[PDB]
RNA sequence: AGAACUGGCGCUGCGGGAUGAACCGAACGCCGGGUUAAGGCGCCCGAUGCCGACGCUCAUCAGACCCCAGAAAAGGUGUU
RNA sequence: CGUCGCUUUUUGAUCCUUCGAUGUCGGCUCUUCCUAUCAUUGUGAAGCAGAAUUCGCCAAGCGUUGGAUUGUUCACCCACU
RNA sequence: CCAUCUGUGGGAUUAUGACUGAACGCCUCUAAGUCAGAAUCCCGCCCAGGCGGAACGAUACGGCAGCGCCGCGGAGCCUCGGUUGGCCUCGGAUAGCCGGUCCCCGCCGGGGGUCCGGUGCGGAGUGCCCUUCGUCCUGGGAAACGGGGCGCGGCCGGAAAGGCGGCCGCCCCCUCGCCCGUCACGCACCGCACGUUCGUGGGGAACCUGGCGCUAAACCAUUCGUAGACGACCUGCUUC
């Protein structure tokens, strides 16, 4: 079709101040700072208005599958406002039958060392993407918590535990064993 | 004398088609920094059609047979080779006015390099379509000189940012030196006929 | 079409030009790649095999049936007198490979280096390096010889050491030293180059380079067997007795339609005398040989803690075809590439 | 980023084609790659020019959408484009590029002799600043 | 005391794909790359100056190792501003890529 | 394998179809200038080195010019 | 019940090349290639509890034997894997 | 295998399982963007080293010769090709370029406010030389460095193929090394081509030629047997 432009706007609260180098978006907030580069996506980024700080991403002309990519800009941008003002927290619990799944943390949250996964002698040292850290939970059994500012660094690192506790050569309809995520929340709440 | 073509940002066959016509016509052409040549289509596709080229091999001995070069200076050289009549002596000499290099050698790091707008990626690809670098499709297939080339380029490019430091030091000076006085009589006739 | 019975290829195609090697001394194709976090050391060393014996040892190995029992092992021994450092080479990394930057040879060079630089030491005037030694002593050459070290330190990044053997300490006939060129893998290239300026024209023993119960490589040229047939060079099966015109031949050497014999088929030619690398040879003992005359000649080799007898490792009657080992040695578990009296290069 | 748009009234230059070098005003767009333009005071009348042939400037004009020839003409001169066009640095570049193009053989002699005279004087007064630069940095 | 000739190179002969017509050359005069701007060069006298080892000269009266083949520009060739041109001998085919020398003779300007 | 009508090949070069008996143009004394046919004009390789027009299409098996030298039923919230 | 295809390891059909000759079965020996995968690697699906099987996927890297009867190709049996 | 010893790791990923996330207000492994990922693949290890380079050694006496290096002028032989050079940022492309107060990295560079220009004019549709016939007489503008060097000496700069460059001290020297004007001559060879450069190019061979330097090594024969069909290969041959 090659339509005349589309645009989404992003309402930005005051405790986060966004600058842009170009198609790079620099997001600074209370609990740190994080940046992305969108130099592959062929759009313009214009932050408009004083005192209100609106961010309008608009793509002129464009094909239908390049109309689908202006919404992907503003959704990654809102997850940078959210992550730098509230953080991300993925709570994962250990689902197991007869064998308990023992889990510790070796180095400062950066290493999770899983052992006794379904009676096995082989350890599973899962290192994490830099920026996230772990915690054994309190007032709940067998739970692990992951906290950080970037959702792609929390969730990919959450997938490295869930992929490591994988049952081979067996039925996975029974033998439900592993450390699966349970909740998708934030570090600071109710804001 | 010789045109010096900086190879990066160019496409493989659009650049090689212009060189293979300028070199039958009697010019000397030096293509420099072939590591940065783009090639259209995504990287996995261009890496497949070079691995399909590698299995082309004469059965009875591979020592005689197709010589699969691995440096991007020679990948680009064999692309120009296939656009020249290289089995005649009018085409043997045509391959010999082409000195294609890799990185930028010490004769050629201090010459002004030209580009070809007829073969640049920005001009000739539509930007929503993918491309492959010739640097890492060489590296994925058998080339062992990527890191020792990038080390020498960032030492080469650092010796030129101090050259361009002091080149625009002179340009700031001679723009303030032309501020002064009494050359207005000569600017009467140059502004009149395109300063 | 389709042999009816599977069978694998005879011989390996990874050693395929079964050729007389172009070198008698084994060439290190690859030294160990370093990081500068290690202390400064050598990596390779020349040696001459004398022959083999065997051994008895109390092998500790839990799990096995070999545990806490005496087990014999074939051992070769290699006579290694100390090397003597002559040269320093510098290699600068390029986008075409390593390239020799320049070399600096020692202030005064031995008799047996200089014999390696000739094809007829008898007819020669013995004139090699005679004008090169006079740039160590003149004032103008000396300031631009130590400038070639300061330019070596600036640009080139891997440096090597030219060292030769002392053939005078050996029972052989040869008296030409073998001149090797071995890589130092220390820390920075300033400390790596100052460690060799310190120690030109000086001896480097074999215990300073290698250690006991440490595992190395052996590089050399094999026993030469000559021009041998298909069934001995390639271990092809003999044909039956009834075969006209010959037993020890390969019968079919190709199909019709590739109308051309392949490299992958077996046919007769030179067997043996090939350049090979054995990997993972353990050192059993570093020897020390025929020391000071205060006690007139302490032989004392092969005298273990459980032996306590005045023995020496050279066998009763001498090493066959070799001579009599008066120098340091390294003994290696198992078989080792080469004839007796052959230069083989040990390498970490 | 995208400081000048096509728009009803946007005064465009014309690079190539059979109306090359003259200005137009975009009156109406038709579909995606062609636009109805006219120049009422610059001798290119109402017709459809493609966008890759035209050349957007910083001048807008205020007249109603798809007007007649007269109301573009009144808007062309109430804004006084043709005086304001020629006093910009890009109309001076397109004028100077065809002053050099018509430089005859005798005039190119005079452009020569009065160039090597001033290149001496600029090279004297830029080398009398090199001596002045080390004398500053000598203390 | 100065060059008075345009720079050309001899590219090839007038050919189809297989058979070629040796009697007319075709030339790429430099700087002109459009058919509309080659009307200046029609009728100009072009020359192929080359070296030998025997001796010949016209003007000075003392011979040298230089000799020449004279020709003239006939018509344009294609849209790319090159030119076909017919000499008084045929070109040696040694000169493929080498220059020839396009003068400023028989010019209306 | 066997007939009908017409043309051709055999007896026939030439331009083109990369290659070629028969396809497509065109038939031929020896040459110069001009212009075309079929086919083409990124580079082999003459000629688009036109500021050519409108759209369609992404292939981890893309497509690419009569004869003609490789595909079907069926299917796709892939895109138009 | 249908119905669309592929392949040229079956057998035909045809008669283009060869009749001033292309040495015609099988085995043995030996090299390479293909994939329409028996096994080995990584996997998805079961009427997958485990064990064992079964059906697909990337994949031809590496293996695919010792014998009795028979000129056998083919067969069939013993045994190992 | 009838004795004995040894057989070695990295990359990008296929299948597949995922993450973020639209299209399609949700959902979604995919559309852009990321992850894990293998007997495959590519390299390493290992084998061979190219009409492919490199670093370094010594370089022909004898009794006359002989050979390198530097500075030469002279004539002839062979191969011909070119007619002025640009001595350089990175790069982005839905973005770039320049100049500049303040905050920091051993008197340079990075950040931001500020000002510009921007179909690029601090524009290779360009810029520096120049299209310079020479000279003489004779005035203005410019110009106080002198500029060509076979000078002499010193510095440090350039290792990816540095073979090229910058600076300084003394020196035989110029005071026209430019622009405008004055005066008047040089082959004015009587209309005509191969003119005008690179350039005292490259290669070979000898002569007249000043100075500084050098005094070898291969191959055969003989020997060896770590080697061999033959060549090849590994070695010995000191007056102890
Ligand atoms: Mg190596
Ligand atoms: Mg064997
Ligand atoms: Mg017809």
XYZ file of C-alpha atoms in Angstrom, chain C residues 40 42 84-88 104-108 136 145-146 149 153 159-161 184 189-204 208:
38
model
C 60.035 -16.685 30.936
C 62.165 -22.021 26.395
C 74.307 -22.846 23.473
C 72.431 -19.663 22.573
C 73.813 -17.778 19.557
C 71.099 -15.679 17.959
C 67.926 -13.732 18.586
C 71.363 -10.572 15.925
C 74.058 -13.228 16.312
C 76.407 -13.577 19.264
C 79.615 -11.638 19.841
C 81.795 -14.682 19.140
C 80.458 -5.779 18.240
C 73.793 -3.263 17.126
C 72.106 -2.276 20.395
C 67.641 -4.587 19.907
C 61.730 -4.390 21.253
C 61.019 -13.538 19.432
C 63.000 -16.737 19.049
C 66.455 -17.974 19.958
C 60.658 -17.887 24.102
C 58.455 -8.617 24.712
C 60.880 -6.366 26.588
C 61.464 -8.959 29.310
C 61.416 -11.669 26.651
C 64.219 -9.930 24.775
C 66.274 -8.968 27.812
C 66.250 -12.595 28.957
C 68.149 -13.536 25.785
C 70.522 -10.550 25.716
C 71.594 -11.718 29.186
C 72.507 -15.176 27.997
C 74.071 -15.221 24.561
C 77.017 -17.652 23.992
C 76.057 -19.524 27.189
C 74.844 -23.021 27.948
C 71.204 -23.946 28.530
C 66.136 -25.963 32.917
